[PDB]
Amino acid sequence: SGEAPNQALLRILKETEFKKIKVLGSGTVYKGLWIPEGEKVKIPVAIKELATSPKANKEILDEAYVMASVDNPHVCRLLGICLTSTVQLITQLMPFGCLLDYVREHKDNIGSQYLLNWCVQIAKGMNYLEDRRLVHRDLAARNVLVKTPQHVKITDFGLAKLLGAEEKEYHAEGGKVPIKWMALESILHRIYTHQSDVWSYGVTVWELMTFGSKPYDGIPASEISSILEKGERLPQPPICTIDVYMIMVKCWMIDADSRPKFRELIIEFSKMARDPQRYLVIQGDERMHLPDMDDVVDADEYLI
């Protein structure tokens, strides 16, 4: 067989097993409890539905197809779907919300250990997504969720595409795409590879280091294609040593094969996470609380 059978289980859940408790966003996302029938368990969940359009349920279901196929500590789990009036997605609740809003809100308690670790964790999820031959196509700080301050997960696969065991790209079409996080080949030829995920990783790391800044704040999207062609990129963030900023910049090579692989980002940021203060200069760094062997890396961070 050309490709491997996807034997993920799609679980369908009874309407009465939830206890939807509150809106988190407005489709519309909710907080709730899931009590599996019989089992002595209560599981905190987010429930995401959408009125019903025949075109809307087709897209949320692709999202479920993907979320149901991924299984990694740094990627979000689908717990199931509920097939009522309108289709609901069910995931593990990530109590602290998306990471973008979180760095903004907690700016003054976020120290370099957390920043660099988040970076390691996002790279691990993304490297896993790559192993499963899946191109996220929408990586950004808004699409990273926080389980605890110690633990983030990649989310929002409403654009993920699977590549064959021999297809080395994706050719997309019409539809809204966030262009500021987009590799260049993706703005010119609508090309998307694992390596164009790496670009957006670049921009995502830049969001964290600048504690939640909008990229090219001001610059309208129609020009972005041109600015990037004239050799211009995002500025070095204040807290950033050239060592860190240099990795960001490498993620933005125009030649996508010269950009780093997610498994290299994991190794680079690991080493830096071992002396956080030598790499990020954060004022008041040492005393912060949220709720030679330069080259040593742990095997758990060495994934080839």
Swiss-Prot record:
Residue numbers marked as site, Important for interaction with PIK3C2B: Y302
Annotated consequence of substituting Y302F: 50% decrease in interaction with PIK3C2B. 65% decrease in interaction with PIK3C2B. Abolishes interaction with PIK3C2B
Residues given in the record as ATP binding sites: L24, G25, S26, G27, T28, V29, K48, T91, Q92, D156
PTM-bearing positions, type Phosphoserine: S1
Effect of L50F: Found in a lung cancer sample
Superkingdom field: Eukaryota
Record: active site: D138
Effect of I12A: Abolishes phosphorylation
Cellular compartments annotated: Cell membrane; Endoplasmic reticulum membrane; Golgi apparatus membrane; Nucleus membrane
Sequence position, cross-link Glycyl lysine isopeptide (Lys-Gly) (interchain with G-Cter in ubiquitin): K22, K40, K55, K58, K168, K230, K261, K271
Location of Phosphotyrosine modifications: Y170, Y302
Sequence positions bearing N6-(2-hydroxyisobutyryl)lysine: K48
Distribution of this protein across tissues and organs: Ubiquitously expressed. Isoform 2 is also expressed in ovarian cancers.
Consequence recorded when altering P5A: Reduced phosphorylation
Described purpose of this protein according to its UniProt entry: Receptor tyrosine kinase binding ligands of the EGF family and activating several signaling cascades to convert extracellular cues into appropriate cellular responses. Known ligands include EGF, TGFA/TGF-alpha, AREG, epigen/EPGN, BTC/betacellulin, epiregulin/EREG and HBEGF/heparin-binding EGF. Ligand binding triggers receptor homo- and/or heterodimerization and autophosphorylation on key cytoplasmic residues. The phosphorylated receptor recruits adapter proteins like GRB2 which in turn activates complex downstream signaling cascades. Isoform 2 may act as an antagonist of EGF action.
Disorder this protein is connected to according to its UniProt record: Lung cancer: A common malignancy affecting tissues of the lung. The most common form of lung cancer is non-small cell lung cancer (NSCLC) that can be divided into 3 major histologic subtypes: squamous cell carcinoma, adenocarcinoma, and large cell lung cancer. NSCLC is often diagnosed at an advanced stage and has a poor prognosis. Neonatal nephrocutaneous inflammatory syndrome: An autosomal recessive disorder characterized by intrauterine growth retardation, premature birth, fragile skin, recurrent skin infections and sepsis, failure to thrive, nephrocalcinosis, and nephromegaly with tubular dysfunction. Some patients have chronic diarrhea, and necrotizing enterocolitis.
Family: Belongs to the protein kinase superfamily. Tyr protein kinase family. EGF receptor subfamily.
Protein name: Epidermal growth factor receptor
Lineage, highest ranks first: Eukaryota, Metazoa, Chordata, Craniata, Vertebrata
Gene giving rise to this polypeptide: EGFR
Stretch of the intact protein here: 695 to 1018 of 1210
